Each structure stands twice: as structure tokens, then as C-alpha cells.
């Protein structure tokens, strides 16, 4: 019926000056563009249809052609940046923003979706969507007493589109836009739908990916406890963005990092640092490395939560990328820690898995490991116990690795390797 029309016929109907013939041809265009197998986006663009579709967004007396043209334009805008640009260049942003207030919820939702595709192209189109005024009416759709009264799909699309207005950098979204969105975003982050929770966390993750002033806007809204709860979710599509966000926040100030600790995040890391998904393990170890770069009382809280044995475990066996973050987390621990903290590392078994990694290739990890070894030896001295550590390094076959490191392209490796063999 409207199935498998040629572009030629679509064009004839759209050019017919009969609104009902235009509707059938727009539907036939929508069905072609709905096809997962290479939709003919470029053929539709070349046939000159975008400006007609945009004019159809304004036909308030024919809501079905508003819907069909919004859907066809959504799927053109879902393509490449050139394809999204064709939609923007036809005037679609203000026309979609006017449809946010449509009394037809399926049409309002389609306009939300299209504006998400447009804003998801990048920061320039995101900011252009913001400048045309999209935030006020999007937020008004969510200004209800209880989110649970909205249709599940409508809520998910609105959250997803808001997340694209939080996304991307160079520049980051305008500060006033972020402040305007946050209260609603924090409400979505307490909702019970797993897809809404996941997309909300992705949005918070985008907002905390930046300077400490961006982190602070977020932290000051009280989201860290809910992030910590979500970090314990069963569903990995929630854990993954919750963990990204927490990891971003601890790149900030010692005081922002302490909000994460105070909220209980460390108690989740036994699971995170043994998580069967490699990416979770890796991101959890990276986060640990920015916590052990904190204050000594923060290091002490790492120790108290029992996490030093979990870092030994990762050094001992993990994906090579995860092991390298573990090495960083240890080097940072040794650099900022007390003598008592540093010796505890050796008591937990750090030496042997550290040495076994000296036989790696990536020169960076060797420099990171060697810096830790040195920092540990310097703590041994303060106690008069360097010989005991020297023996350890020998019985595990460390010296063997350390000596051969002198034979390394990066003479920095060669420099440190030799210097240690010397003094010890």
C-alpha cells in the first residue's frame, strides 16, 4: 500500500498539491527510511524532499502528516553529520521545537527524538538547538508530580534527548543550560526504569567530565549517594555509567573525592575490582588510582575498606590494560602514603606481582613500577629494613628483571634500574 514505493512516486505524490496524496507519499517515504538495511537517506535528500517535509511539520490540521514527516526527518537526521545537516539546513529545529507543545503525545515524542538526533551530532548543533529555545519546553514535559504517570517510552526518549544536550565538549554545554537541566536530571536519576537510570547516569557522566567547577555544579546537587547506590546495581548498563561518573568526580578536588568516600563508594569496590566485565574492572582500578592520589586520610580509608588485597589481585591477574592502571594506583599510593601505609603494601603481597610485570614491554609501566619500588625502599630505610626488602626482591627474582632493564631503549628505565641496583 505504502510499501516499497519508488522515490519517483514519492516525489510525484509530495508535489501533487493534494494534502492527502502528500500524506501517503510521506508515509511511503517514512517506511523506506525505517528500513534497517541501508535506508535510502541520500536518495531522499537528493530528491529535494527535506523542505517539503519541514513544511509538513507545520500542518496543524493534518496531524498524521506532521507525525509521518517528523518520523522521516528523524531518520534522515539519524544518519551521518552531512545528513543531519541537511535536516537542520531545511529549517527543522524551530519547527520541531514548536511541535514539543503538540497535544498529540506521539507527535511531541517524535519531535523530542528528532531534536535528540540533531543535538547528538555535536556541540555546534547541540548549542544551536539550545539557542532556538529547546530546553524550556522539553523540561515542561517532565514537570509532573510523579514521573511514573508518563508513558515509559516517552520518558526514555525525553531522558535520552536531555542526555544529548549534556553531551560533548569543546565547548561543554553552556553553564546556564546545565543549571537549568540539572534539577530535572536529578529527578530522572531517582526513577525506577533501568533505561531512564542508565541514560541519566550517562548524562551526569558527561557533566562531570570536565573542570572541577563542572564537577562541583553536579556534586552540590547531592547526586553522589544515588550514584553510589546505582554503582551497586545488577544491570551493567547502569553500573557502567554510574562508575564513569564516580570516576570523573574523583578527578576533582580532595574534597570532592571525599564526598564519594563519605557516601560509601569504597565498600562497592570488592565487587567492582573482581567484576567479570573487563571494562568495569579497568574503570574501577582507574578510579582507585585517583583515590590513592588523594590525602593520607583518604589512603587510610582505602586500607580500612580492605582494598589493598584487591589491588594485589589485579596486579596478579587481570587484563593487561587493568594491570597498568593497578600499577598507577600503587605508584600513587607509595608517593603519598605514610611509612606505615607503604609497609602494609608489602605485607599484603605487592612485591611479587609487581616484579612479574617488569617483564612487560610498555615502557611506561616499567617507569611506574620502578617509581613505586623506589618509594617503597625509601620507606624501608626510614625503618632500617632495606636489606629485608632487597632479599624479597631477590627471592622472587626481581633483581634479575631489574638488572636486564638497564638494557632498555628509554634510558630513564636504564637510569632508574641501575640506580636501584646501586643503593640496594
Amino acid at each position: 500500500g505504502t510499501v516499497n514505493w519508488s522515490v519517483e512516486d514519492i516525489v510525484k505524490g509530495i508535489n501533487s498539491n493534494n494534502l492527502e496524496s502528500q500524506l501517503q507519499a510521506t508515509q511511503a517515504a517514512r517506511k523506506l527510511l525505517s528500513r534497517e538495511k541501508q535506508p535510502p537517506i541520500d536518495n531522499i535528500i537528493r530528491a529535494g524532499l527535506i523542505p517539503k517535509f519541514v513544511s509538513f511539520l507545520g500542518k496543524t490540521d493534518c496531524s498524521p502528516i506532521q507525525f509521518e514527516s517528523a518520523w522521516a526527518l528523524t531518520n534522515i537526521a539519524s544518519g551521518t553529520s552531512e545528513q543531519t545537516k541537511a535536516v537542520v539546513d531545511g529549517g527543522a529545529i524551530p519547527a520541531f521545537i514548536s511541535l514539543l507543545a503538540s497535544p498529540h503525545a506521539h507527535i511531541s515524542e517524535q519531535a523530542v527524538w528528532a531534536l535528540g538526533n540533531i543535538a547528538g551530532d555535536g556541540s555546534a548543533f547541540r548549542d544551536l538547538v539550545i539557542k532556538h529555545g529547546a530546553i524550556d519546553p522539553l523540561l515542561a514535559l517532565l514537570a509532573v508530580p510523579d514521573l511514573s504517570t508518563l508513558a515509559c517510552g516517552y520518558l526514555r526518549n525525553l531522558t535520552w534527548t536531555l542526555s544529548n544536550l549534556c553531551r560533548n565538549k569543546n565547548p561543554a554545554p553552556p553553564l546556564d543550560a546545565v543549571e537549568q537541566i540539572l534539577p530535572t536530571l536529578v529527578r530522572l536519576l531517582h526513577h525506577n526504569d533501568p533505561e531512564v537510570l542508565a541514560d541519566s547516569c550517562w548524562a551526569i557522566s558527561y557533566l562531570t567530565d570536565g573542570p572541577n567547577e563542572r564537577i562541583e555544579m553536579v556534586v552540590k546537587k547531592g547526586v553522589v549517594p544515588q550514584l553510589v547506590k546505582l554503582l551497586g546495581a545488577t544491570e551493567l548498563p547502569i553500573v557502567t555509567p554510574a562508575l564513569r561518573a564516580i570516576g570523573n568526580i574523583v578527578t576533582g578536588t580532595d574534597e570532592q573525592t571525599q564526598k564519594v568516600i563519605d557516601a560509601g563508594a569504597l565498600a562497592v569496590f570488592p565487587s567492582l575490582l573482581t567484576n567479570p566485565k573487563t571494562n568495569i574492572q579497568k574503570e574501577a582500578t582507574w578510579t582507585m588510582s585517583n583515590i590513592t592520589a588523594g590525602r593520607q586520610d583518604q589512603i587510610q580509608q582505602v586500607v580500612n575498606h580492605g582494598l589493598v588485597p584487591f589491588l594485589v589481585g589485579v596486579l596478579s591477574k587481570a587484563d593487561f590494560k587493568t594491570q597498568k592502571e593497578a600499577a598507577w594506583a600503587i605508584t600513587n599510593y607509595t608517593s603519598g602514603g605514610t611509612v606505615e601505609q607503604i609497609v602494609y603494601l608489602v605485607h599484603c603481597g605487592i612485591i611479587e606481582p609487581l616484579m612479574n610485570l617488569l617483564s612487560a614491554k610498555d615502557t611506561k609501566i616499567i617507569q611506574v613500577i620502578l617509581d613505586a619500588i623506589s618509594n617503597i625502599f625509601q620507606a624501608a630505610e626510614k625503618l632500617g629494613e632495606t636489606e629485608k626488602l632487597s632479599i624479597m626482591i631477590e627471592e622472587c627474582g626481581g633483581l634479575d628483571k631489574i638488572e636486564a632493564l638497564q638494557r632498555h631503549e628509554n634510558e630513564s628505565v636504564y637510569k632508574a634500574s641501575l640506580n636501584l641496583i646501586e643503593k640496594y
Binding site: 525505517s34 528500513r35 534497517e36 535506508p39 518520523w71 528523524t74 531518520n75 537526521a77 539519524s78 544518519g79 543531519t84 517524535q110 527524538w113 535528540g116 538526533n117 547528538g120 551530532d121 535520552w160 542526555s163 544529548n164 553531551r167 541514560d199 550517562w202 555509567p241
Partner: peptide
């Protein structure tokens, strides 16, 4: 997370 989404139904 997807930057863009096609509507297929």
C-alpha cells in the same frame, strides 16, 4: 551510548 537512533517501528 548511541549518539543517534533510527526509528524502525
Amino acid at each position: 551510548p548511541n549518539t543517534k537512533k533510527q526509528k524502525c517501528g
